[PDB]
Scaffold this motif. Structure first.
Motif, PDB file in Angstrom:
ATOM      1  N   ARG A  30       0.834  -1.204   0.000  1.00 37.96           N
ATOM      2  CA  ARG A  30       0.000   0.000   0.000  1.00 37.96           C
ATOM      3  C   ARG A  30       0.871   1.258   0.000  1.00 37.96           C
ATOM      4  NH1 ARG A  30      -5.089  -1.244  -1.787  1.00 37.96           N
ATOM      5  NH2 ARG A  30      -6.412  -2.251  -0.194  1.00 37.96           N
ATOM      6  N   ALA A  31       1.802   1.328   0.951  1.00 37.81           N
ATOM      7  CA  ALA A  31       2.691   2.473   1.092  1.00 37.81           C
ATOM      8  C   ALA A  31       3.538   2.687  -0.163  1.00 37.81           C
ATOM      9  CB  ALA A  31       3.576   2.314   2.320  1.00 37.81           C
ATOM     10  N   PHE A  32       4.023   1.589  -0.748  1.00 40.95           N
ATOM     11  CA  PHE A  32       4.797   1.659  -1.982  1.00 40.95           C
ATOM     12  C   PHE A  32       3.976   2.246  -3.135  1.00 40.95           C
ATOM     13  CE2 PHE A  32       4.985  -0.651  -6.032  1.00 40.95           C
ATOM     14  CZ  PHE A  32       6.156  -0.137  -6.579  1.00 40.95           C
ATOM     15  N   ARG A  33       2.826   1.634  -3.412  1.00 42.36           N
ATOM     16  CA  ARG A  33       1.993   2.024  -4.544  1.00 42.36           C
ATOM     17  C   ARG A  33       1.417   3.427  -4.349  1.00 42.36           C
ATOM     18  NH1 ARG A  33       2.093   1.409  -9.764  1.00 42.36           N
ATOM     19  NH2 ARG A  33       2.849  -0.690  -9.230  1.00 42.36           N
ATOM     20  N   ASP A  34       1.053   3.751  -3.112  1.00 45.56           N
ATOM     21  CA  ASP A  34       0.599   5.091  -2.771  1.00 45.56           C
ATOM     22  C   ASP A  34       1.674   6.125  -3.115  1.00 45.56           C
ATOM     23  OD1 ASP A  34       0.511   7.272  -0.193  1.00 45.56           O
ATOM     24  OD2 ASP A  34      -1.393   6.916  -1.245  1.00 45.56           O
ATOM     25  N   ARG A  35       2.918   5.827  -2.750  1.00 49.35           N
ATOM     26  CA  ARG A  35       4.019   6.762  -2.928  1.00 49.35           C
ATOM     27  C   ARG A  35       4.476   6.900  -4.380  1.00 49.35           C
ATOM     28  NH1 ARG A  35       6.193   9.882   1.474  1.00 49.35           N
ATOM     29  NH2 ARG A  35       8.142  10.832   0.700  1.00 49.35           N
ATOM     30  N   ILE A  36       4.448   5.800  -5.123  1.00 45.75           N
ATOM     31  CA  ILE A  36       4.972   5.798  -6.484  1.00 45.75           C
ATOM     32  C   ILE A  36       3.925   6.180  -7.543  1.00 45.75           C
ATOM     33  CG2 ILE A  36       4.799   3.358  -7.313  1.00 45.75           C
ATOM     34  CD1 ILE A  36       7.967   5.626  -7.247  1.00 45.75           C
TER      35      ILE A  36
ATOM     36  N   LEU B 214      -4.076  -5.729  -5.719  1.00 42.78           N
ATOM     37  CA  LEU B 214      -4.593  -4.609  -4.933  1.00 42.78           C
ATOM     38  C   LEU B 214      -5.049  -3.453  -5.827  1.00 42.78           C
ATOM     39  CD1 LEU B 214      -2.413  -4.373  -1.699  1.00 42.78           C
ATOM     40  CD2 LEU B 214      -4.431  -5.781  -2.139  1.00 42.78           C
ATOM     41  N   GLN B 215      -4.458  -3.350  -7.013  1.00 46.11           N
ATOM     42  CA  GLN B 215      -4.914  -2.395  -8.020  1.00 46.11           C
ATOM     43  C   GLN B 215      -6.124  -2.927  -8.772  1.00 46.11           C
ATOM     44  OE1 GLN B 215      -1.297  -0.215 -10.109  1.00 46.11           O
ATOM     45  NE2 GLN B 215      -0.701  -2.234  -9.334  1.00 46.11           N
ATOM     46  N   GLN B 216      -6.115  -4.233  -9.042  1.00 41.97           N
ATOM     47  CA  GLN B 216      -7.141  -4.905  -9.831  1.00 41.97           C
ATOM     48  C   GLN B 216      -8.520  -4.784  -9.173  1.00 41.97           C
ATOM     49  OE1 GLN B 216      -6.545  -9.394 -11.396  1.00 41.97           O
ATOM     50  NE2 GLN B 216      -4.998  -7.975 -12.238  1.00 41.97           N
ATOM     51  N   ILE B 217      -8.561  -4.932  -7.847  1.00 40.01           N
ATOM     52  CA  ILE B 217      -9.820  -4.910  -7.080  1.00 40.01           C
ATOM     53  C   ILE B 217     -10.515  -3.539  -7.019  1.00 40.01           C
ATOM     54  CG2 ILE B 217      -9.143  -6.911  -5.681  1.00 40.01           C
ATOM     55  CD1 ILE B 217      -8.710  -4.996  -3.316  1.00 40.01           C
ATOM     56  N   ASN B 218      -9.820  -2.483  -7.434  1.00 45.11           N
ATOM     57  CA  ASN B 218     -10.428  -1.153  -7.534  1.00 45.11           C
ATOM     58  C   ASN B 218     -11.221  -0.954  -8.822  1.00 45.11           C
ATOM     59  OD1 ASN B 218      -7.459   0.306  -6.085  1.00 45.11           O
ATOM     60  ND2 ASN B 218      -9.360  -0.291  -5.055  1.00 45.11           N
ATOM     61  N   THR B 219     -10.926  -1.778  -9.823  1.00 47.33           N
ATOM     62  CA  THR B 219     -11.331  -1.496 -11.196  1.00 47.33           C
ATOM     63  C   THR B 219     -12.122  -2.652 -11.825  1.00 47.33           C
ATOM     64  OG1 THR B 219     -10.469  -0.350 -13.167  1.00 47.33           O
ATOM     65  CG2 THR B 219      -9.332  -2.391 -12.515  1.00 47.33           C
ATOM     66  N   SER B 220     -12.157  -3.776 -11.117  1.00 41.34           N
ATOM     67  CA  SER B 220     -12.761  -5.001 -11.609  1.00 41.34           C
ATOM     68  C   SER B 220     -13.464  -5.698 -10.447  1.00 41.34           C
ATOM     69  CB  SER B 220     -11.671  -5.893 -12.215  1.00 41.34           C
ATOM     70  OG  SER B 220     -12.154  -7.187 -12.526  1.00 41.34           O
ATOM     71  N   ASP B 221     -14.337  -6.650 -10.758  1.00 43.31           N
ATOM     72  CA  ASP B 221     -14.947  -7.478  -9.719  1.00 43.31           C
ATOM     73  C   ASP B 221     -14.408  -8.911  -9.757  1.00 43.31           C
ATOM     74  OD1 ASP B 221     -16.369  -8.354 -12.007  1.00 43.31           O
ATOM     75  OD2 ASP B 221     -17.957  -6.873 -11.578  1.00 43.31           O
TER      76      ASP B 221
ATOM     77  N   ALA C  40      -7.286 -10.846   3.700  1.00 42.87           N
ATOM     78  CA  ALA C  40      -7.216  -9.852   4.760  1.00 42.87           C
ATOM     79  C   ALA C  40      -7.700  -8.469   4.287  1.00 42.87           C
ATOM     80  CB  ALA C  40      -5.811  -9.778   5.333  1.00 42.87           C
ATOM     81  N   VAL C  41      -7.413  -8.114   3.037  1.00 43.43           N
ATOM     82  CA  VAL C  41      -7.890  -6.844   2.490  1.00 43.43           C
ATOM     83  C   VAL C  41      -9.412  -6.858   2.335  1.00 43.43           C
ATOM     84  CG1 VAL C  41      -7.844  -5.253   0.499  1.00 43.43           C
ATOM     85  CG2 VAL C  41      -5.700  -6.209   1.390  1.00 43.43           C
ATOM     86  N   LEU C  42      -9.939  -7.934   1.759  1.00 44.56           N
ATOM     87  CA  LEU C  42     -11.371  -8.033   1.477  1.00 44.56           C
ATOM     88  C   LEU C  42     -12.231  -8.173   2.728  1.00 44.56           C
ATOM     89  CD1 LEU C  42     -11.237 -10.204  -1.754  1.00 44.56           C
ATOM     90  CD2 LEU C  42     -11.547  -7.724  -1.572  1.00 44.56           C
TER      91      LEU C  42
END
Length: 287
Positions: free
Chosen positions: A207-213, A241-248, A282-284
């Motif tokens: 999360r911290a990585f992708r948020d920052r980059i 973690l990116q996929q779950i924002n844009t797809s089901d 754990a995310v879901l």
């Protein structure tokens, strides 16, 4: 799509996990075993040249030819184009990642040159330099703010930030008056054996990585020790973690399959494969 893809409906993920992990992970084991030969018929010619052998940590972890990162050649040197590294796909690009082994002292100049020539602005390191008293990675970066040259590449620490599970370091990279900032994300908590427990520590890092980059359009360098196990685990997790924002739907099997085509052993162990699933679970479930 069934051979190189197992899409799972996000709303059914808890069930799928329970089903896959039942009977001491029978179905997980079966599924991961389907991947074992993927991409292994592809040639690794350059990696096995006499001039390049000293540049590989392991005799059995070699970059595929079709896929390898090529350094600019130096005119009188045979494998000056060679580094143990492979373009590997991500969520955003078929060449989103360059995954490589932890540099040897002998290859850290090559490593920095790859960072420069690839125009990379981010390195992800998923190992400690020493684990169980064995060298897993040469420390290729400075200990203080004193600039250090690696080949023609000048590296200087601007600042660093220490967290519970990782260290973020901001570098200035200079080559002959050309100047860049690169960020170094060093996960420091991966245990001596097994996988992170609880998995949430790894999720927090992703999360911290992708948020920052953000949505980087230039290659992100990823390495651990051999550059296959922890590296594959990180990429798959970052991707989903990116996929779950844009797809089901989520397709972890499909991710790993595609990665295997580009670099040997990308998610290395069955345990790492299951760990990817636990992380997403754990995310879901809101942790």
């Amino acid at each position: 799509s069934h051979m190189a893809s197992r899409p799972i409906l996000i709303k059914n993920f808890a069930e799928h996990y329970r089903l896959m992990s039942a009977d001491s992970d029978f179905r997980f084991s079966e599924e991961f075993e389907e991947l074992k030969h993927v991409g292994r018929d592809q040639p690794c010619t350059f990696a096995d040249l006499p001039c390049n052998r000293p540049k590989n940590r392991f005799t059995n972890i070699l970059p595929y030819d079709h896929s390898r990162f090529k350094l600019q050649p130096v005119d009188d040197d045979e494998g000056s184009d060679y580094i143990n590294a492979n373009y590997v796909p991500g969520h955003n690009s078929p060449r989103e990642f360059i995954v490589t082994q932890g540099p040897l002292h002998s290859t850290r100049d090559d490593f920095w040159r790859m960072c420069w020539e690839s125009n990379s602005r981010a390195i992800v390191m998923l190992t400690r330099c020493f684990e169980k008293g064995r060298e897993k990675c040469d420390q290729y970066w400075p200990n203080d703010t004193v600039p250090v040259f690696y080949g023609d590449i000048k590296v200087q620490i601007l600042n660093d930030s220490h967290y519970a599970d990782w260290v973020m370091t901001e570098f200035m990279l200079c080559r002959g008056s050309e100047q860049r900032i690169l960020r170094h994300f060093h996960f420091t908590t991966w245990p001596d054996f097994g996988v992170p427990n609880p998995p949430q520590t790894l999720v927090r890092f992703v999360r911290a990585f992708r948020d920052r980059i953000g949505a980087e359009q230039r290659p992100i360098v990823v390495h651990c020790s051999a550059g296959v196990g922890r590296s594959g685990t990180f990429i798959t997790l970052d991707r989903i973690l990116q996929q779950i924002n844009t797809s089901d739907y989520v397709d972890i099997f499909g991710i790993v399959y595609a990665m295997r085509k580009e670099r040997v052993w990308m998610v290395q162990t069955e345990q790492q494969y299951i760990c990817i699933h636990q992380c997403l679970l754990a995310v879901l479930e809101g942790k």
